[PDB]
TrEMBL record, chains A, B:
This is Core gene UL42 family protein. It comes from the Viruses.
Length: 287, 287
């Protein structure tokens, strides 16, 4: 019983390919998910990053369901690994392949997944079957649109690169916990590790803003919003990778957000104009 | 019309896996072939090596044909690339996979190839279809058993490693032609390149021998057979790789053979006892 299938908009994925090539090593061992409404589900990839971080690439409107699916009108949630064990098959690698003509993903019994890839020469194809076994990993990203007032920071290229150079030169063989804090009194965020610190000041926006709109901005000055002092102590490896993964040239630039729920999020803030169906971020877990 | 299929003895390939892992980068872009009798065909992989060399791994008795094939009793010859263009599918990579449970290759119209792989979890599988388009590359290896008297050389580990160290330290960015010659008068083989040479002497066997049996031997002395002076001028890149590819620890050790037909062959001479169904060599083309 073929309960649910979807056709993959490969043309859309091509335009987004650059984002996938930048995060590919981090997501090779990841989890691929198909979730949201049965009508227009989201395609997303997740994977751990360093000791306590979680990457999430989420692509809306890249899928069209096949007519005659049993379970409709409500939601959908299929979660599997993109690289099945033993295999030489990486879903996202092939979904984003350059020489890909068409692609589809089917589900059936919710324990099995079939991905069909059709290559350039209108002749070569691959049909990979596997198990849907990552039900524990939820699609917990394209959410929490309300609330607003959150403590967030957006650093420019110059400051952002300088912050990264500094971070990695503190790195050793073993991981360390970095405490990141934000002062509302002084408009300052400090990175503290071992016995050294990095201080960065920012211009706080008076006007009440939401998300990142109205903080760009990032030409030569560092901007931020803060309503309570914040303090987080996250994994250094996760931080480096997070800041490196969300810096996608011609696409995203890192933004830090302090969630009410102990979580520091590194988010790719769109620098361009063709990443509307895409969200990229890394949740840094409190250590 | 499913004209011809074969079941792959993965258990046998496992025991041989070590040979495949050593030549994998050289064969990634290679050609896979199924040839010989329809009853027991040979599985082999070919690929160029440097500017003018041809690697050939050939495995006998690793295949069992499926009952009901149209064309029988006579021979078979199917030649395709192991990495189809655009794909993330390498036949040999998956045929030799560790977590492989079973595998089969089918042919049908002689233009199409299907390889079915079944992984460890008796659940994951891959079905890759492609085109049989390398008809020009013939299976020209497990042949020429007669003739005999050929000029051949077998160097020990010490001499062989010293020869390789010397070769690669002559290497530059650009390739050069190395002339390799053999003197019957003096039992000596010399490697000449640019303006430097390496001289190696060997003990020639009186007793008339065939193939490599009766020249092993390779404990601490270099052995050889020569009936006419030989001179070859092959590609240096090809020579290095050839000597490096045919040196498989616990399996093969390089042997040089001067064929009557302008061709210098670098052959993996079995060092062990479990490589009976396998032949590995590289044909060095005259430059």
């Amino acid at each position: 019983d073929f309960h649910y299938g979807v056709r993959v908009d490969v043309t859309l994925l091509s335009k987004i390919r650059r984002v996938n090539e930048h995060i590919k090593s981090a997501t090779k061992t990841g989890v691929v998910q198909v979730h949201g409404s049965a009508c227009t589900p989201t395609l997303s990839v997740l994977s751990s990053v360093g000791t306590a971080g979680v990457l999430g690439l989420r692509i809306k409107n890249a899928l069209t369901p096949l007519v005659g699916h049993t379970e409709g009108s409500g939601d959908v949630s299929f979660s599997f690994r993109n690289t099945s064990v033993g295999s030489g098959f990486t879903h996202t690698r092939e979904l984003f392949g350059a020489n890909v003509l068409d692609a589809g993903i089917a589900f059936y019994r919710p324990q099995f997944v079939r991905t069909t890839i059709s290559y350039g020469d209108n002749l070569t194809s691959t049909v990979h079957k596997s198990v849907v076994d990552q039900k524990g990993i939820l699609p917990f990203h394209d959410r929490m649109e309300a609330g607003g007032r959150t403590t967030r920071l957006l650093l420019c290229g110059k400051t952002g690169a300088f912050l990264l150079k500094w971070l990695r030169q503190q790195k050793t063989k073993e991981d360390q916990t970095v405490t990141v804090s934000v002062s509302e009194t002084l408009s300052i965020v400090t990175f503290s590790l071992g016995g050294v610190s990095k201080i960065i000041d920012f211009k706080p926006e008076t006007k009440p803003v939401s998300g990142w709109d109205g903080l760009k901005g990032k030409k030569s000055v560092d901007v931020g919003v803060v309503h309570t002092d914040a303090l987080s102590r996250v994994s250094l490896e996760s931080l480096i990778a997070a800041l490196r993964l969300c810096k996608v040239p011609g696409w995203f630039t890192p933004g830090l957000i302090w969630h009410s729920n102990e979580i520091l999020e590194v988010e790719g803030v769109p620098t361009g104009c063709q990443s509307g169906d895409v969200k990229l971020s890394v949740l840094l877990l409190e250590v």
